[PDB]
Structure formats: structure tokens, C-alpha cells
Amino acid sequence: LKDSKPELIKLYSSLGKIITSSLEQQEVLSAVMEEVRLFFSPKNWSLMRYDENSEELFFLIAEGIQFNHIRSIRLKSGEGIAGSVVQTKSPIFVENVKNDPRFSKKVDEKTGFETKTIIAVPMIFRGEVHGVIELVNRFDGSSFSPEDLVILQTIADFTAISLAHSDQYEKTK
Amino acid sequence: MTLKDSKPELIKLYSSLGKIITSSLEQQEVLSAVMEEVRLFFSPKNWSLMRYDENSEELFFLIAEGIQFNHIRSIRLKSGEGIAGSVVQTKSPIFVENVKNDPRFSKKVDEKTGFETKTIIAVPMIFRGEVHGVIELVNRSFSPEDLVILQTIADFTAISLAHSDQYEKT
Numbered sequence: 001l002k003d004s005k006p007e008l009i010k011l012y013s014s015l016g017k018i019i020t021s022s023l024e025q026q027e028v029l030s031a032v033m034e035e036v037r038l039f040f041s042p043k044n045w046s047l048m049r050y051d052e053n054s055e056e057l058f059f060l061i062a063e064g065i066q067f068n069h070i071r072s073i074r075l076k077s078g079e080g081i082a083g084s085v086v087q088t089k090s091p092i093f094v095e096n097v098k099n100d101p102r103f104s105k106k107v108d109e110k111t112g113f114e115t116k117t118i119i120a121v122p123m124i125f126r127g128e129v130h131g132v133i134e135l136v137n138r139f140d141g142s143s144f145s146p147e148d149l150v151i152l153q154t155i156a157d158f159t160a161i162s163l164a165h166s167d168q169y170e171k172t173k
Numbered sequence: 174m175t176l177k178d179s180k181p182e183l184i185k186l187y188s189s190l191g192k193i194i195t196s197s198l199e200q201q202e203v204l205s206a207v208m209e210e211v212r213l214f215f216s217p218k219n220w221s222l223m224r225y226d227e228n229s230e231e232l233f234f235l236i237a238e239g240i241q242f243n244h245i246r247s248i249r250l251k252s253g254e255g256i257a258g259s260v261v262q263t264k265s266p267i268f269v270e271n272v273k274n275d276p277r278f279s280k281k282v283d284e285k286t287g288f289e290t291k292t293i294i295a296v297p298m299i300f301r302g303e304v305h306g307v308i309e310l311v312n313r314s315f316s317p318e319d320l321v322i323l324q325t326i327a328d329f330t331a332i333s334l335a336h337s338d339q340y341e342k343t
């Protein structure tokens with residue numbers, strides 16, 4: 001079936017195994033891509049890292065848009081759905097970004113993509129926010145399940161662990 | 174959203190094992206995290222974690238509960254030696270209901286400890302497709318769910334120990 005419990009627990013217990021398998025940031029980022037693709041195959045999704053010093057978010061991963069167009073983007077805290085996730089430390093689901101004042105058009109203006117829906121989750125490790133993962137125009141009010149949310153939160157949890165350790169390993173070297 | 178089934182809780186449970194075990198880069202904390210999870214899920218009076226040294230192709234003990242560590246500190250198992258050594262070679266779990274009827278069994282440790290081994294469940298610690306060690310539950314049936322939990326502990330412990338080694342080189 002793959003809906004049977006034995007298959008579900010195999011799948012759920014595989015989470016994190018690719019993501020946590022390297023200390024080097026590039027390999028972590030590739031691994032995150034692999035697990036996100038496996039569970040969601042999103043045409044548009046991203047991972048934004050939070051810089052504690054500048055209090056800004058920047059892109060590390062941005063699938064379905066041109067990385068060159070968004071390399072220079074920095075979001076201030078509270079800016080965008082992604083910025084609000086950092087502040088609230090909680091997920092945000094938005095069925096239509098026009099109807100949300102928190103939304104930031106900045107990136108759509110650079111890319112010419114039109115954002116309609118966002119699920120955004122915080123990456124938290126030991127109480128610190130390391131960033132945000134967004135799935136863009138992937139889900140709407142009907143298709144977004146509690147299981148989807150938990151799977152995505154779990155990916156974000158393991159990614160936080162791996163990125164924290166990658167940073168700490170870089171320092172000592 | 175309103176909940177229709179227990180999937181969210183299943184995901185949180187199965188993925189908690191790896192979040193706990195991988196959270197530290199210091200070996201002692203990793204080992205303590207492993208002990209915590211193994212004790213919680215299985216409460217074994219006798220169990221162990223043996224690390225595989227790629228260079229010497231030997232297994233040695235990092236954890237050995239229910240026997241005196243001072244008796245087994247020097248033990249080294251060659252590849253293929255013991256149930257544990259066979260797991261390394263086959264890269265698969267081995268269940269043995271009675272070690273007297275298994276030619277793979279190694280008496281070497283019982284001889285040092287004076288403990289009598291009767292049953293073993295042994296699981297490989299897999300990292301990037303290779304075996305980095307073995308976890309044994311000794312003298313105490315084993316459901317498919319138990320197996321998955323143990324295998325998950327094993328795999329994440331390989332991941333976490335590899336990183337702890339790489340980090341501690343500094």
C-alpha cells in the first residue's frame with residue numbers, strides 16, 4: 001500500500017538521515033533538497049538562513065526561480081512571511097498572499113514569478129532560529145494536511161541541527 | 174487544522190530518535206543520548222554498542238551495559254568474528270535464539286566476563302551504505318516495529334559518531 005503502518009514508519013524514520021549525514025554546508029543543502037523533493041516534489045520552494053547579527057534572512061536554496069535574481073535579497077526581521085516566522089517562531093500558512101499584509105513582494109518583483117500560497121516553517125535548534133523553509137504555490141486550503149505540516153517541520157528541525165553543526169565545524173578548522 | 178488520525182504523532186515519534194541522538198557533536202553526549210533511547214524503548218539488562226574501526230577492520234566496545242567494562246575494554250573482534258562480526262560482513266541484522274547452535278558465535282567475551290550469552294539481537298549501524306558498528310541486545314518476541322526502532326537508533330548513532338569523530342579531530 002505505502003499507506004500501511006509498516007511503510008509509514010519506515011518512511012518517517014528515514015527523515016533526517018540524508019540531511020544529518022554531512023558537516024559541510026553544501027552537502028547539507030543538497031541533502032535537504034533530496035528529502036524535500038522526496039516528500040513534496042515542489043516546483044517552487046526555498047531555504048533561507050537567518051543571520052543573528054544583521055537580523056536578516058538570505059537565500060541558500062531557491063528552486064523554481066533563478067538564483068542570480070535573488071542572491072542579493074536580504075529580508076529584515078518581521079519582513080515578509082518568512083520574516084514573521086522568525087519573529088513568531090511558528091509556522092505560517094497563507095492561502096492567498098494578497099490577503100496578507102505580512103507578505104513581501106520584493107522577490108516576486110525581482111523574479112517575475114507570482115506567489116499565491118506559502119507554507120513557511122521555522123528552523124529551530126536549541127531555541128535559536130536558524131532560518132525558514134518555504135513551499136510556494138504547492139498547497140492550498142484543501143490540500144494541506146496536518147501530516148504535511150509535521151513532515152515539513154521535522155525536515156526543518158533536522159536541517160537546523162545540521163546547519164548549526166556545520167557552522168560550529170567551520171569555526172574549528 | 175482538525176485531526177483525523179494519529180499520523181502526526183507517528184511522525185514525531187519515529188523522527189524523535191534521530192533528533193535526540195544527532196543533537197550533540199561530543200561523543201559522551203551522543204553515547205548518553207543512545208543509552209537513553211535504548212533504555213526507554215527496550216530496557217535491556219545486557220546490551221552493547223561496538224564501533225567498527227575501518228583501518229584495523231575490528232570491532233571494539235563503546236558501551237557495554239550489564240557487564241564490567243574493565244573486563245572487555247581490550248576485546249577486538251576481527252571482521253566475520255562473532256555474531257557482531259558477521260553483521261558487519263552481511264550488513265544485515267542477525268537474530269539468534271540460542272548461541273550454542275550458531276557457529277558464528279564468539280565465546281571470547283563470555284570467557285572474560287563469566288556471563289553466559291544465550292540470545293542475541295544484533296543490528297548494523299549503517300552510514301552511507303557501510304557498517305560503522307553494531308548494537309546488540311543480549312538475553313532478552315521482537316516485533317517488526319522494535320526492529321525499525323532499533324535500526325533507526327543504529328543508523329543515527331553511526332551518523333552522529335562519525336561527525337563527533339570528525340569534530341573531535343580539532
Ligand SMILES: Nc1ncnc2c1ncn2[C@@H]1O[C@@H]2COP(=O)(O)O[C@H]2[C@H]1O
Pocket residue numbers: 043044045046062063064065079080081082083102103104105107108111113115118134136
Ligand atoms: N522557490 C521560490 N520560488 C518563487 N518565489 C519564492 C520562492 N521562495 C520564496 N519566494 C518568494 O519570496 C518571498 C519572500 O518573502 P515572503 O515570505 O513574504 O514571500 C516569499 C515568496 O513570495
Ligand SMILES: Nc1ncnc2c1ncn2[C@@H]1O[C@@H]2COP(=O)(O)O[C@H]2[C@H]1O
Pocket residue numbers: 219220221237238239240254255256257258277278279280282283286288290293309311
Ligand atoms: N552487554 C553485554 N553483556 C554480556 N555479553 C555481551 C554484551 N554485549 C556483547 N556481549 C557478548 O559479546 C560477544 C561478542 O561476540 P558475539 O557477537 O558472537 O556474542 C557477544 C556476546 O556474547
